[PDB]
Amino acid sequence: FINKRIVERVRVGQILAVLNRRFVAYKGKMRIMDITQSLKMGTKLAAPTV
Amino acid sequence: QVYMHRDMLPEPRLDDIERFRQEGFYYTNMLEAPPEIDRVVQYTYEIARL
């Protein structure tokens, strides 16, 4: 006994009844870059923090 | 006292060639008196990065 719906004998009316997971996705023009290797001591910022 | 301004090159009327030739016309970028307080804005390094 698992209490987890692993294998269920379902009818073909509810084969696509699992489509309830929301997804977000980025467009084909966007870029995702790495910035955490740009943390060096000799770098100043233009507008200084508090 | 080195400023930046938008001034034009002077072009005389030239109504007579010989009268204009007898006088001496020229143009400088060295000015007579420095400008007033309310007509100059001061720029630093810090306000230019902002």
PDB file of C-alpha atoms in Angstrom:
ATOM      1  CA  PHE A   1       0.000   0.000   0.000  1.00  0.00           C
ATOM      2  CA  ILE A   2       1.573   3.247  -1.185  1.00  0.00           C
ATOM      3  CA  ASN A   3      -1.267   5.836  -1.007  1.00  0.00           C
ATOM      4  CA  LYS A   4       0.053   7.228  -4.301  1.00  0.00           C
ATOM      5  CA  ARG A   5      -1.843   7.139  -7.600  1.00  0.00           C
ATOM      6  CA  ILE A   6       0.804   5.348  -9.637  1.00  0.00           C
ATOM      7  CA  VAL A   7      -1.204   3.189 -12.060  1.00  0.00           C
ATOM      8  CA  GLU A   8      -4.901   3.900 -12.603  1.00  0.00           C
ATOM      9  CA  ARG A   9      -7.178   2.134 -15.075  1.00  0.00           C
ATOM     10  CA  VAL A  10      -8.972   5.158 -16.522  1.00  0.00           C
ATOM     11  CA  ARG A  11     -11.348   5.615 -19.433  1.00  0.00           C
ATOM     12  CA  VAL A  12     -10.345   7.445 -22.604  1.00  0.00           C
ATOM     13  CA  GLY A  13     -12.486  10.413 -21.593  1.00  0.00           C
ATOM     14  CA  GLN A  14      -9.966  11.278 -18.866  1.00  0.00           C
ATOM     15  CA  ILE A  15      -6.702  10.485 -20.643  1.00  0.00           C
ATOM     16  CA  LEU A  16      -5.988  14.237 -20.939  1.00  0.00           C
ATOM     17  CA  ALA A  17      -7.458  15.042 -17.516  1.00  0.00           C
ATOM     18  CA  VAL A  18      -3.960  15.379 -16.012  1.00  0.00           C
ATOM     19  CA  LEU A  19      -3.323  18.686 -17.819  1.00  0.00           C
ATOM     20  CA  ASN A  20      -3.516  20.877 -14.722  1.00  0.00           C
ATOM     21  CA  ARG A  21       0.158  21.810 -14.264  1.00  0.00           C
ATOM     22  CA  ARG A  22       0.849  25.491 -14.913  1.00  0.00           C
ATOM     23  CA  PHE A  23       3.990  26.227 -16.923  1.00  0.00           C
ATOM     24  CA  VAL A  24       5.875  29.393 -17.828  1.00  0.00           C
ATOM     25  CA  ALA A  25       8.469  29.565 -20.578  1.00  0.00           C
ATOM     26  CA  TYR A  26      10.747  32.203 -22.066  1.00  0.00           C
ATOM     27  CA  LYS A  27      10.647  33.317 -25.685  1.00  0.00           C
ATOM     28  CA  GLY A  28      13.235  32.499 -28.328  1.00  0.00           C
ATOM     29  CA  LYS A  29      14.877  35.932 -28.249  1.00  0.00           C
ATOM     30  CA  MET A  30      15.764  36.011 -24.544  1.00  0.00           C
ATOM     31  CA  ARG A  31      19.149  35.126 -23.065  1.00  0.00           C
ATOM     32  CA  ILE A  32      20.031  33.695 -19.656  1.00  0.00           C
ATOM     33  CA  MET A  33      23.555  34.659 -18.616  1.00  0.00           C
ATOM     34  CA  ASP A  34      25.833  33.881 -15.690  1.00  0.00           C
ATOM     35  CA  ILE A  35      26.717  36.859 -13.482  1.00  0.00           C
ATOM     36  CA  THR A  36      28.071  35.332 -10.260  1.00  0.00           C
ATOM     37  CA  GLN A  37      31.600  35.131 -11.695  1.00  0.00           C
ATOM     38  CA  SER A  38      31.703  38.934 -12.089  1.00  0.00           C
ATOM     39  CA  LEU A  39      32.252  39.672  -8.382  1.00  0.00           C
ATOM     40  CA  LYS A  40      35.721  41.202  -8.061  1.00  0.00           C
ATOM     41  CA  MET A  41      37.117  43.717  -5.600  1.00  0.00           C
ATOM     42  CA  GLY A  42      38.364  46.278  -8.118  1.00  0.00           C
ATOM     43  CA  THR A  43      34.920  46.979  -9.597  1.00  0.00           C
ATOM     44  CA  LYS A  44      33.136  50.230  -8.756  1.00  0.00           C
ATOM     45  CA  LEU A  45      29.469  51.024  -9.315  1.00  0.00           C
ATOM     46  CA  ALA A  46      28.151  54.234 -10.840  1.00  0.00           C
ATOM     47  CA  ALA A  47      25.423  55.020  -8.307  1.00  0.00           C
ATOM     48  CA  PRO A  48      26.692  54.144  -4.820  1.00  0.00           C
ATOM     49  CA  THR A  49      24.605  52.355  -2.226  1.00  0.00           C
ATOM     50  CA  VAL A  50      23.816  53.483   1.312  1.00  0.00           C
TER      51      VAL A  50
ATOM     52  CA  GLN B   1      37.868  78.521 -16.337  1.00  0.00           C
ATOM     53  CA  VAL B   2      37.217  76.279 -19.332  1.00  0.00           C
ATOM     54  CA  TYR B   3      33.541  76.073 -20.283  1.00  0.00           C
ATOM     55  CA  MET B   4      31.511  74.440 -23.040  1.00  0.00           C
ATOM     56  CA  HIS B   5      29.017  76.504 -25.027  1.00  0.00           C
ATOM     57  CA  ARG B   6      27.074  76.381 -28.291  1.00  0.00           C
ATOM     58  CA  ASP B   7      28.171  79.524 -30.128  1.00  0.00           C
ATOM     59  CA  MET B   8      28.340  80.009 -33.880  1.00  0.00           C
ATOM     60  CA  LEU B   9      31.066  81.245 -36.180  1.00  0.00           C
ATOM     61  CA  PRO B  10      30.315  84.877 -37.099  1.00  0.00           C
ATOM     62  CA  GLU B  11      29.499  85.720 -40.708  1.00  0.00           C
ATOM     63  CA  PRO B  12      29.719  89.432 -41.598  1.00  0.00           C
ATOM     64  CA  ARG B  13      27.303  91.253 -43.880  1.00  0.00           C
ATOM     65  CA  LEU B  14      30.062  92.059 -46.437  1.00  0.00           C
ATOM     66  CA  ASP B  15      28.194  94.932 -48.082  1.00  0.00           C
ATOM     67  CA  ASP B  16      31.522  96.327 -49.311  1.00  0.00           C
ATOM     68  CA  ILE B  17      34.728  94.413 -49.968  1.00  0.00           C
ATOM     69  CA  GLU B  18      37.159  97.307 -49.517  1.00  0.00           C
ATOM     70  CA  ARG B  19      35.568  98.712 -46.350  1.00  0.00           C
ATOM     71  CA  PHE B  20      35.577  95.282 -44.695  1.00  0.00           C
ATOM     72  CA  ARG B  21      39.170  94.742 -45.825  1.00  0.00           C
ATOM     73  CA  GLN B  22      40.371  97.985 -44.216  1.00  0.00           C
ATOM     74  CA  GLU B  23      38.956  96.980 -40.854  1.00  0.00           C
ATOM     75  CA  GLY B  24      40.217  93.887 -39.095  1.00  0.00           C
ATOM     76  CA  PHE B  25      37.712  91.133 -38.339  1.00  0.00           C
ATOM     77  CA  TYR B  26      38.547  87.925 -36.478  1.00  0.00           C
ATOM     78  CA  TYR B  27      37.005  85.486 -34.017  1.00  0.00           C
ATOM     79  CA  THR B  28      38.314  84.014 -30.767  1.00  0.00           C
ATOM     80  CA  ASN B  29      37.252  81.375 -28.315  1.00  0.00           C
ATOM     81  CA  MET B  30      38.840  83.418 -25.514  1.00  0.00           C
ATOM     82  CA  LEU B  31      36.139  85.545 -23.907  1.00  0.00           C
ATOM     83  CA  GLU B  32      36.285  88.844 -22.044  1.00  0.00           C
ATOM     84  CA  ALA B  33      34.559  88.161 -18.709  1.00  0.00           C
ATOM     85  CA  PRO B  34      33.442  84.829 -17.232  1.00  0.00           C
ATOM     86  CA  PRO B  35      29.703  84.060 -17.318  1.00  0.00           C
ATOM     87  CA  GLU B  36      27.258  84.678 -14.504  1.00  0.00           C
ATOM     88  CA  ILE B  37      26.345  82.272 -11.723  1.00  0.00           C
ATOM     89  CA  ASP B  38      22.775  81.478 -12.814  1.00  0.00           C
ATOM     90  CA  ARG B  39      23.854  80.599 -16.379  1.00  0.00           C
ATOM     91  CA  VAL B  40      26.510  77.962 -15.593  1.00  0.00           C
ATOM     92  CA  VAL B  41      25.895  74.466 -14.221  1.00  0.00           C
ATOM     93  CA  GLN B  42      28.715  72.703 -12.387  1.00  0.00           C
ATOM     94  CA  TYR B  43      29.591  69.119 -13.300  1.00  0.00           C
ATOM     95  CA  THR B  44      31.677  66.787 -11.158  1.00  0.00           C
ATOM     96  CA  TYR B  45      32.765  63.225 -11.693  1.00  0.00           C
ATOM     97  CA  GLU B  46      30.138  62.028  -9.225  1.00  0.00           C
ATOM     98  CA  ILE B  47      27.132  63.806 -10.735  1.00  0.00           C
ATOM     99  CA  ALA B  48      28.136  62.605 -14.215  1.00  0.00           C
ATOM    100  CA  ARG B  49      28.065  58.939 -13.184  1.00  0.00           C
ATOM    101  CA  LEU B  50      24.590  59.468 -11.712  1.00  0.00           C
TER     102      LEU B  50
END
